[PDB]
Design an enzyme around this catalytic site. Structure first.
Site, PDB file in Angstrom:
ATOM      1  CD  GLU A 163      -2.070 -11.290   4.166  1.00 56.06           C
ATOM      2  OE1 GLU A 163      -3.269 -10.968   4.029  1.00 56.06           O
ATOM      3  OE2 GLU A 163      -1.250 -11.191   3.215  1.00 56.06           O
ATOM      4  CG  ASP A 210      -2.295 -15.743   1.184  1.00 54.30           C
ATOM      5  OD1 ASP A 210      -3.537 -15.777   1.251  1.00 54.30           O
ATOM      6  OD2 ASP A 210      -1.630 -14.661   1.358  1.00 54.30           O
TER       7      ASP A 210
HETATM    8 ZN    ZN Z   1      -6.034 -10.864   0.725  1.00 47.56          ZN
END
Ligand code: ZN
Length: 323
Positions: A163, A210
């Site tokens: 990511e 997240d």
């Molecule tokens: Zn990060």
């Protein structure tokens, strides 16, 4: 020409009553998650590193020991990067692979690359070791209920690799695992044998966690096509709060507030959102103060906030799946 991909538009939750909410609150253990699911991930695990391999084995092993019928797939691929061609491996865990629809929970398991600095190593505790651990604890806590799935709808967990940018974010240096998997799913017929529907049409909703784990997070309601589900998180939080099932929590300091955020946040949901998948993005705004700093570590995590969010998310998933 079946209208099944439209079912997600009318899907309603089966709301848990007070007794069931107490059961869910009592059925998750933040100390067990901490020791068994989180600590093994608080290691350097940038793509291609030994830690990436160790984290992947840990995630797979923790899912494999459960009773529910999880089907694990490792999605390995190559991508160009600022450092040349490299290999990445997304982890996908699915209950009922042939079910047409899946509610999808996801996070990234790689940690951002940083050369060691003054003997400190970046482990990305909120980013996103905690989200990984929350997904593993949800699978564990709800295992008996999930085993019953063994409404052609089930659950899938995705742990994205890559990511993070290897340098600072750029369109080509970031979201390696999600750009790859979104494209793969978009070009894969689903259910098996289908003439014109893909695995993306089967994604009812992508709930992406997240940067979770710091104190006082505030999650904005980012998208109108998932706003009704954001409202469910607000309702679940409110009811768990009123039942005295949350810890060190007040409604003035609630996590799901009434407020939107019109800007774009670059994250793993982007390749899915741009292909039409509804997204519920559980990322706080502002980001944790320790964001992309060596202080994004265990010491700075807020235990009760993570516990509270585990309860809210587990209720959300059971209500969505009618379990
Ligand atoms: Zn990060």
């Amino acid at each position: 020409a079946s209208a099944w991909p439209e079912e997600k538009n009318y899907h309603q939750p089966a709301i848990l009553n007070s007794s069931a909410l107490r059961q869910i609150a009592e059925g998750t253990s933040i100390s067990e998650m901490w020791q068994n699911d989180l600590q093994p991930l608080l290691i350097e695990r940038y793509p291609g590193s030994p830690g990436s391999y160790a984290a992947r084995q840990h995630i797979m092993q923790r899912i494999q020991r459960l009773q529910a019928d999880w089907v694990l797939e490792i999605d390995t691929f190559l991508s160009q990067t600022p450092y040349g061609y490299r290999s990445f491996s997304n982890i996908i865990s699915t209950l009922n692979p042939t079910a047409k629809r899946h509610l999808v929970l996801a996070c990234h398991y790689d940690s951002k690359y940083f050369s060691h600095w003054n003997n400190r190593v970046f482990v990305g505790a909120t980013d996103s070791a905690v989200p990984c651990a929350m997904m593993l604890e949800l699978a564990r806590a709800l295992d008996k209920k999930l085993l019953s799935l063994k409404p052609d709808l089930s659950l899938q967990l995705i742990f994205f690799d890559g990511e993070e940018a290897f340098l600072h974010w750029s369109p080509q240096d970031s979201l390696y695992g999600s750009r790859h998997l979104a494209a793969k799913m978009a070009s894969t017929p689903h259910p098996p044998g289908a003439r014109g529907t893909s695995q993306l049409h089967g994604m009812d909703l992508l709930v992406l966690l997240d940067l979770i784990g710091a104190p006082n997070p505030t999650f904005p309601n980012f998208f109108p096509n998932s706003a009704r589900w954001f409202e469910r998180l607000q309702a679940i939080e409110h009811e768990l709060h009123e039942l005295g099932l949350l810890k060190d929590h007040s409604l003035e300091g609630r996590y799901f507030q009434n407020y939107s955020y019109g800007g774009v946040i670059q994250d793993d949901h982007i390749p899915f959102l741009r292909r039409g998948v509804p997204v519920l993005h559980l990322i706080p705004s502002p980001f944790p103060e320790v964001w992309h700093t060596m202080d994004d570590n265990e010491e700075n995590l807020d235990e009760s906030t993570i516990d509270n969010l585990n309860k809210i998310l587990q209720v959300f998933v059971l209500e969505y799946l009618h379990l």
